[PDB]
Amino acid sequence: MIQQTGYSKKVMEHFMNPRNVGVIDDPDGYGKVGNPVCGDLMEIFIKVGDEKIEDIKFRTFGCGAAIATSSMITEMARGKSLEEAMRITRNDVADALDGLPPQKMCCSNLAADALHAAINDYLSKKQ
Amino acid sequence: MIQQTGYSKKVMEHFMNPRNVGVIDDPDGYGKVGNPVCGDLMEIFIKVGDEKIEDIKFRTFGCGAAIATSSMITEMARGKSLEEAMRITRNDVADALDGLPPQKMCCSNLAADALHAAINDYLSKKQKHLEH
Ligand code: FES
Ligand code: FES
Ligand SMILES: [Fe+2]
Ligand SMILES: [Fe+2]
Ligand SMILES: [Fe+2]
What we know:
The structure is a homodimer. The first copy, chain A, is an alpha+beta fold. The first copy, chain A, has helices at about 10-15, 65-75, 80-85, 95, 105-125; strands at about 30-35, 40-50, 50-60. Chain A has one domain (about 25-125). Chain A is built from five helices and three strands; from the N terminus they run H-E-E-E-H-H-H-H. The N and C termini of chain A lie far apart (about 55 Å). The interface between A and B is medium-sized, with 14 and 14 residues. Chain B: One of its GO terms (biological process) is iron-sulfur cluster assembly.
């Protein structure tokens, strides 16, 4: 078949063994975003120590692509400064996600969006 | 809230600890169906012994609802006769699925559809004397 899309080994790994699944009780930052197509929700929790992401968790009922991308992005964001974290997007893992069905772009965007939201929440709390 | 939707505890359980995830190499029956809206694929693999489902696996990259329903339905189908298996639908776990966002109906249909497809595959192999 021409124009094959599907699931790569990295993505599969992230699906099967996602990093940073769960919740943080009374978090410094909480972000929740929704996928406009399927309606799945993505939630990200941050603990901020120094001015860095000390801990990060995510939970979602969405699809394999959303979960793997969340695994990736939260791994990336662990230990980064808030400023660095705010600049993380799905592009930072474009290599891993290449070959995914293209409709999973929205799924992939959930993670970074939720991170951003969390950070914003934290900032506003800091007022 | 009006028109409340959400997720049950059973569905949560199935999402977190799904039964029968994976593949069967050289299966007696193979079924693959697709969700027309998101594009996710659902695959079911059966081993048939004594005109029963001896072993069953599923593989999907779809959403929590799809995965939990698959977990349920493959659990149900283990050990059933082909005839019984063909009659299993999402309705057999209607209680677990009640109140899901309505877009998850197609997600929930994937499992039983793929089961059906698998069984049909097996049957047609049998008819063609190509079964093992
Ligand atoms: S299908 Fe809903 S997040 Fe991907
Ligand atoms: S969103 Fe794709 S199977 Fe449910
Ligand atoms: Fe989108
Ligand atoms: Fe549908
Ligand atoms: Fe369907």
